[PDB]
């Protein structure tokens, strides 16, 4: 369809052929998942999505620098608490989060790229994605990894700049974008379903606060207090010059994805900003909302004939590398952390067969989960990822932090607090997945107690309550560096300048 022209397929085939050739010859920070989620949330809600990454850095480096002299992830818990129950439970959370926020989302972004590059169904898309993933893995893709990773991040970002200009040239430049966006919505706001009826203007017009990082703290998409605190909590679970470069590349996404995500809504309002349920289905595959098509739609309908194929190939290659790496990590974790514990005999070949069968099992589970991903948190990938992280990680972060700071905590108390935090998190994961989330068009029947609060304020609540549980149970039961610092503060100043500019 979009790439039906010979040139796009030629570049895609050439790129994949070179990737496989290097993989045979053997014998990063940003993937396609973020390139999809950030752009989708930028199209849907404005630019407060970029209020995550920048904030994350201003926390990460702080907790990367203000914790080093005092602390010097799971391995620390292993030394501090000992035993094996906490090891097994942390491995279980790691596997579940890999399935939910690293595997399901990676395949979903893959199906949201092949869907808008060819038009295939979600399953027809992930089937091809996983077939090519298997080809990549069986050809020694992981054997190269770091070898052919830098080059990827030297094009996927670089090419993402080529799109940036191509996106910013079709909106009359940077100044032009900031007038067009507020005045860009759908022309189809009438639904044939009698129950839906006419669609209100609140959730088909772009938000009034689409240009401010600090949204309303009570009625905002990304409340600033929730933003700050929830992100500093979640970032705990998810050399120094490496961190400085990571921050440099972490500042850009606002200009590279979020804003070109904002451009999608104004070049393609009917598709990216669809509000009518059945209209989204014919566009997307789901009737909850489809900003997630923001970046892939922009890539396929904006990039030239020859560079669109290159962008698709690079996105798919990075997604393939991420998926293969996470499959390998999950298999290794399962067959060296949990299954081995269940079977101490340590069979010569069982530890490998069980790894491959686990790989197949998680592939199946994530394929079954894909429908939930495509219709999670109003159809926004970034919101779903951060919601799952807010539901699962904050308890682990609380246990880690109170272990680092408080020496009166107990391993048994730590484990009980961790199970309490997981149970608390499943009181919003399960109910806000089985009952759905829904957009303003079709609000879900979820009780106001559960879905009323933003997932970041739930991160705050769950972190604090999990910490309190851990502490009470533990008590109750039983008894050139100068140059690096200068560059770090320069980067921090630049980041706060960017925050103030878009505050």
């Amino acid at each position: 369809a979009l790439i039906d022209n010979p040139a796009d397929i030629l570049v895609i085939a050439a790129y994949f052929l070179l990737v496989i050739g290097v993989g045979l010859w053997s014998m990063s920070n940003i993937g396609s998942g973020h390139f999809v989620g950030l752009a989708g949330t930028g199209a849907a809600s404005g630019l407060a999505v970029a209020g995550f990454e920048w904030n994350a850095l201003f926390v990460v480096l702080l907790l990367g620098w203000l914790f080093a002299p005092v602390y010097l992830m799971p391995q620390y818990l292993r030394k501090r608490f000992g035993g094996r129950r906490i090891r097994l439970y942390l491995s279980v959370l790691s596997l579940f989060l890999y399935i939910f926020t690293k595997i399901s989302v990676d395949m979903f972004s893959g199906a949201v790229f092949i869907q808008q590059a060819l038009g295939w169904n979600i399953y027809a898309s992930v089937i091809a994605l996983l077939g090519i993933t298997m080809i990549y893995t069986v050809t020694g893709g992981l054997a190269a990894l770091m070898y052919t990773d830098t080059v990827q991040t030297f094009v996927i970002l670089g090419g993402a700049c080529i799109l940036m200009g191509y996106a910013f040239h079709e909106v009359g430049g940077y100044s032009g974008l900031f007038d067009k966006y507020l005045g860009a919505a759908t022309s189809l706001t009438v639904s044939e379903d009698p129950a839906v009826g006419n669609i209100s203007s609140f959730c088909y017009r772009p938000r009034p606060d689409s240009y401010h990082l600090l949204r309303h703290p009570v009625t905002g998409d990304l409340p600033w207090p929730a933003l700050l605190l929830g992100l500093t909590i979640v970032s705990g679970w998810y050399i120094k010059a490496g961190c400085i470069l990571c921050g440099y590349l972490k500042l850009t996404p606002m200009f590279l994805m979020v804003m070109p995500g904002m451009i999608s809504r104004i070049l393609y309002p009917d598709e990216v900003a669809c509000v009518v349920p059945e209209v989204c289905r014919r566009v997307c595959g789901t009737e909850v909302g489809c900003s997630n098509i923001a970046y892939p739609r922009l890539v396929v309908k904006l990039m030239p004939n020859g560079l669109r194929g290159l962008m698709l190939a690079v996105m798919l290659a990075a997604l393939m590398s991420s998926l293969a790496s996470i499959f390998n990590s999950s298999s290794t974790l399962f067959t060296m952390d949990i299954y081995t514990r269940l079977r101490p005999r340590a069979g010569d070949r069982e530890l490998l067969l069980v790894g491959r069968l686990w790989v197949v099992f998680i592939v199946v589970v994530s394929v079954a989960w894909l429908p939930v991903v495509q219709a999670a948190q109003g159809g926004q990938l970034f919101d779903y990822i951060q919601a799952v992280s807010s539901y699962l990680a904050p308890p682990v972060s609380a246990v880690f932090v109170l272990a680092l700071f408080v020496p009166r905590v107990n391993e048994q108390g730590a484990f009980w607090g961790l199970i309490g935090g997981l149970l608390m998190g499943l009181a919003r994961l399960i109910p806000e997945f089985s009952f759905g989330s829904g957009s303003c068009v079709q609000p879900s029947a979820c009780p106001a107690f559960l879905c009323g609060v933003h997932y970041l304020y739930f991160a705050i609540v769950l972190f604090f309550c999990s910490g309190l549980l851990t502490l009470t149970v533990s008590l109750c039961t039983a008894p050139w560096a100068r140059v690096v610092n200068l560059n770090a503060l320069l980067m921090m100043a630049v980041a706060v300048f960017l925050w103030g500019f878009y505050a």
């Binding site: 100043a493 706060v496 300048f497 960017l498 103030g500 500019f501 878009y502 505050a503």
Partner: peptide, 30 residues
């Protein structure tokens, strides 16, 4: 109604003040 660059410069100045405080505290006592 401060311009965006006013807000950016204000943030930079505030952070530089905080950095000066954090440098003076350890300049005075460990």
């Amino acid at each position: 109604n401060l311009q965006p660059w006013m807000q950016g410069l204000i943030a930079v100045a505030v952070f530089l003040v905080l950095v000066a405080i954090a440098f003076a505290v350890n300049h005075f006592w460990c």
